[PDB]
């Protein structure tokens, strides 16, 4: 099985870093020399993570100003949503250094996303691209590929795309709305979002995604089938066991309640949210009754947790609940055996985390094309957990909408608390299976290899 030098290339957010670089652990273990290429503050807070520092080295790149960015801007942690695109013009402009690193390291294989450009630079040096995208292969399955003579309507993305294999997928007219307005999104240099993705889709040598045949399977075969070319699955990438302590402010407050009674809910760590819905949220998890931890930013206009929280609050939740505003080992609480309960903001590395988990999982998607389908098909088409409901139009929830998520789940009386709960351990019994990560990465490799 000879051995590979992959180059690395994600677009400049945590959340494309950070599965590139889990990614770049299943490949380094398995001989595979990396180069990963990470703006160049922004290494330090990755070095930790990297399990292979015989084979996988850092190659920080500066990202480059532009007129709007913030000084030192690097990745999207650093900007308002407004300004993204101005990091992707950024990224768009470190091309000629990408040239230069490519033509020294001579890796075989560059894995990228949203560098349009990249597939002629590859090609140009006998390198070979593959488009690795941290979406779930769902995602640009249903959302892509209907007939173009006009322009695609609301009423449009009501039914599949020809060939989708499944039926339709359920979308609220506030989703629809954002839906349809992200056709239009232009994304660093003058260039359709749209266009970005699909430029790197049809001249890399293959499309990636994580995943396992038996879910993504027929998603990553529809899309070969409209594109006609190679779409890989590396794998569902699990968490690697990691030999480590919890915190001990956490391993006691945890240990302290009955087993599977605890709610830990993670939404509102990525991005601050508006006051209202935090509020709504926070209060949401004490009219449950249940014991929580709630691991989340402050919200917008706020700078702490503390100075956010309704007065009365804190003396409610005494014993039961926590609101806590600082850095938690996520994967190592939802290993506790006391939590019973998981809302998640429905990213994929969230989402892995807590299938791999017994905990009843609650949905409570982050505005986002990957979000909404992944919470799709996590609640109505695998049905494992349930989602928090949302008013039609304005996509908000309740503290009541938050309370009823929950209370289903954790009545272990209710029916659909046990539905999902029981297809919840079937998911879970197949990717802990004992050659399905493990086999699934081999193949990958087999793949990445057929490509030279």
Known sequence: APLLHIAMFPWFAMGHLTPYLHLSNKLAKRGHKISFIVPKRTQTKLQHLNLHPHLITFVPITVPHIDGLPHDAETT???????????????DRTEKDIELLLRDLKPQIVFFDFQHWLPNLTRSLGIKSVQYLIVNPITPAYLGNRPKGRDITEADLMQPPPGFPGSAIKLHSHELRFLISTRKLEFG???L???????????????AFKGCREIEGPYAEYLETVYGKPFL?????????????????????????????VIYCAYGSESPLQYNQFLELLLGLELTGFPFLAALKPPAGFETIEEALPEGFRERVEGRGIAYGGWVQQQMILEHPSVGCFITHCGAASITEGLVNTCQLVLLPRLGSDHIMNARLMSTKLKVGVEVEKGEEDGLFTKESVCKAVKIVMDEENEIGREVRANHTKVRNLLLSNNLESSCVDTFCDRLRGLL
């Open 193 to 207: 979002f749209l266009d970005r993705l699909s430029i790197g889709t049809r001249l890399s040598d293959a499309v």
């Open 189 to 191: 240099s003058g260039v």
């Open 77 to 91: 942690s650093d900007v308002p949503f407004s300004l993204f695109t101005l990091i992707a013009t950024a990224m």
């Open 233 to 261: 699955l590396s794998g569902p990438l699990l968490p690697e066991p990691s030999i480590s302590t919890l915190e001990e402010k956490w391993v006691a407050w945890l240990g302290g309640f009955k087993a599977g009674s």
